[PDB]
From Swiss-Prot:
Species of provenance: Homo sapiens (Human)
Intrachain S-S bonds: C62-C72, C86-C106
GO MF term list: amyloid-beta binding; cysteine-type endopeptidase inhibitor activity; endopeptidase inhibitor activity; identical protein binding; peptidase inhibitor activity; protease binding
Coverage span on the entire protein: 38 to 146 of 146
Protein name: Cystatin-C
Function text: As an inhibitor of cysteine proteinases, this protein is thought to serve an important physiological role as a local regulator of this enzyme activity.
Amino acid sequence: GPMDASVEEEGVRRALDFAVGEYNKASNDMYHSRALQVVRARKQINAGVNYFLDVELGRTTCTKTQPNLDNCPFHDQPHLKRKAFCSFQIYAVPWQGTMTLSKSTCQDA
């Protein structure tokens, strides 16, 4: 397409978790950020699958040291939540078991 896709789709959800994981891995934040909301999801199928995700992210109260990232509420202070808007492009070739982040551009939302 890219054609419309939904966070309801297993593949979109796997690409999201992958992208958000790369985002945390790359940041200098002592704390975990998570996706607030996928505002737009699209995918394109050819030699692989390209996912295009527009995502709002926010900072949580869980340190990245946390072995438990299962329950991390966003900050209720806007200058601590620091809401970000991100466009991720994830390239997956599921039948070869690969997934790479082709593009990640994030700024204040």
